[PDB]
Symmetry: C2
Subunit: 362 residues, 2 copies
């Protein structure tokens, strides 16, 4: 007896095209998405070249339209030079991404004044998401208040961060956040096994107390999102390991396991992988789209999942209960039992659909 879920949405993925296609491309990363029960992804802009201007966005849009197997939206990235220049194309993007700490990106902003300039110039009705760790969460919240608008905090990983956001929500401030599976299911206790190269990720893995604080404060978490950040094993195990974990194929099985154990409800899961992504990013419905899962199947995560070109996973060896059996995307069978059955290019840019534009005053 399968359970039918709506088309799930991952608002934080790195698909590496253009410029890092040995790590992943649109075709491989969206195959991984479908195998993970995800039918729509929002792709981050820290590619090579980065998606920080109109020509780069135009290129990325065409590469995605030609390679994507599921539907998508593309983020623009904030840079030290592009505030005030993105107005014509802003509404075609998922939103604007700010990189406010050291991570796998060349887009760090060097002054809070540059953050203010982005918050002041980016259209006020369109999403802004921030990579903002520890005190940076409080700093970007201040900038959002000074500019009188909302912000969404990416990959919250620490007790400190979730409690700050909790306090902000208690004061009625317009802040939402997302949490990635590695910060719910891995901790410092796993760094022995992972090693210092594989274990590199931003935000770094938290303590057991961080993990327990995120679960305890599930009500404060608006979305789950994988931060699928594929890098090859050679890169993760080499001298200058880039941070990040692949995660599209493992996210839903990990969370279904938690549902089966009573750690959160099916509704809690669907708010965080469907309804809240839709409403925060104004992402449109997908007609005739659903995911069928088998909640009874017990399996052990292997050393690599079938589709991501990362060809490794930090969840290797974890026992899960729950698997994706079938995905239907816009009336076509997209995935069955380990086989992706829609070709590269089946996926569409949801921001071009009439229902996918963000509403705005004239």
């Amino acid at each position: 007896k399968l359970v039918r879920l709506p088309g799930l949405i991952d608002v934080h993925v790195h698909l590496r095209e253009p410029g890092g296609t040995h790590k992943e491309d649109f075709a491989s990363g969206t195959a991984a998405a479908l195998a993970g029960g995800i039918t729509m992804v929002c792709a981050m802009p820290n590619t090579r070249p980065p998606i920080i201007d109109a020509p780069a966005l135009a290129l990325a849009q065409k590469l995605a339209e030609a390679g994507a197997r599921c539907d998508f939206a593309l983020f623009l990235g904030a840079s030290s030079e592009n505030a005030g220049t993105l107005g014509t194309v802003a509404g075609s993007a998922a939103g604007l991404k700010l990189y406010l700490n050291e991570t796998y990106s060349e887009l760090r902003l060097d002054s809070v004044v540059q953050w203010m300039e982005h918050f002041e110039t980016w259209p006020s009705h369109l999403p802004i998401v921030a990579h903002a760790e520890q005190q940076t969460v409080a700093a970007v919240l201040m900038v959002a208040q000074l500019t009188q608008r909302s912000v969404h905090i990416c990959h919250v990983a620490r007790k400190e961060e979730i409690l700050l956001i909790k306090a902000a929500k208690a004061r009625g401030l317009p802040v939402t956040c997302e949490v990635a599976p590695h910060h719910l299911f891995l901790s410092h206790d796993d760094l022995e096994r992972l090693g210092p190269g594989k274990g590199e990720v931003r935000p770094e893995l938290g303590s057991r107390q961080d993990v327990e604080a995120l679960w305890e404060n599930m009500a404060v978490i608006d979305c789950f999102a994988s931060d699928h950040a594929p890098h090859t094993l050679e890169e993760k195990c080499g001298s200058r390991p880039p941070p990040g974990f692949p995660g599209l194929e493992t996210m839903l099985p990990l969370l279904l396991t938690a549902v089966s154990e009573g750690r959160l409800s099916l509704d809690d899961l669907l708010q965080r992988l469907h309804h809240n992504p839709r409403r925060i990013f104004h992402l449109p419905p997908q007609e005739d789209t659903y995911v069928e899962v088998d909640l009874e199947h017990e399996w052990t995560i292997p050393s690599h999942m079938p589709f991501s070109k990362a060809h490794w996973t930090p969840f290797e060896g974890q026992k899960v209960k729950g698997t994706v059996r079938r995905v239907v995307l816009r009336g076509e069978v997209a995935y069955i039992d380990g086989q992706v059955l829609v070709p590269p290019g089946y996926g569409q840019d949801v921001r071009k659909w009439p229902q996918g534009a963000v509403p705005q005053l004239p």
Copy 2:
């Protein structure tokens, strides 16, 4: 023809007693204050032991009462363990100091939640000052808003910081700030001469653009304060140089030079070294107290000033115009032309004066 000034107040000094008395003690640091035309100092809590609990404050109070030559108030320091424990003694302190970045202190707080706990537990009518650099300024401002109270930002040094504070003031937020003389009169252009050891200070010396932004935004600066941070030449030139500059004896001559050049007015100076310190920290008047300065005397700062045990200065070689000729403190001649004439112990804790308590609702 001398000019009579009121008793000037430095709200940010390190007098090193207890525990670092080779760098400075109450007697030597307050002699330096008097020679710099300063009649009241607020001493920071990063001593050894640090002033982070009632017994340490009691000791420091007695050492100051016995050694100080000018009047004073003593800050308490926030620690990772003392939130909620300072209520009985809080009103006897200048205020509470938070160390939110790496600097010469063991008091760094490791989580914004600890900042929130201090803002929630410290009595709401009493001052809070923060060492908060770059984005940390925005972060502590957010914490202040969440807790619905004011904050004072220590040693603002960068264009980024002064513009953030400017934006906060434009939104009506209760924030004040101070700037130290080295961030108005030294820059990266001076690191060649100073060297990497002497030049170590927190916040670090800024660019010419940082310095010009502070001057351009003088209206945003509420106070000048020296951040007199004496360390010996051996320490500054050694393998692990501590950050900080001595500055009590040079602050007023540097600023008088700027007044003579029309860079700010005498009133601008007196707001920032007298009236605003009084009103932000609720520091009492000093009866029969004044400073006589000679605005015409041109001199070159030497390799060390007479009184601070630091026995060095980063302003060596700068030409100044303006000198302190006489200080009268509470009816006694305290300083004339290079000689301090009040003994250790003449100075008093202003928080014990009836007029020196911070007003509060019953």
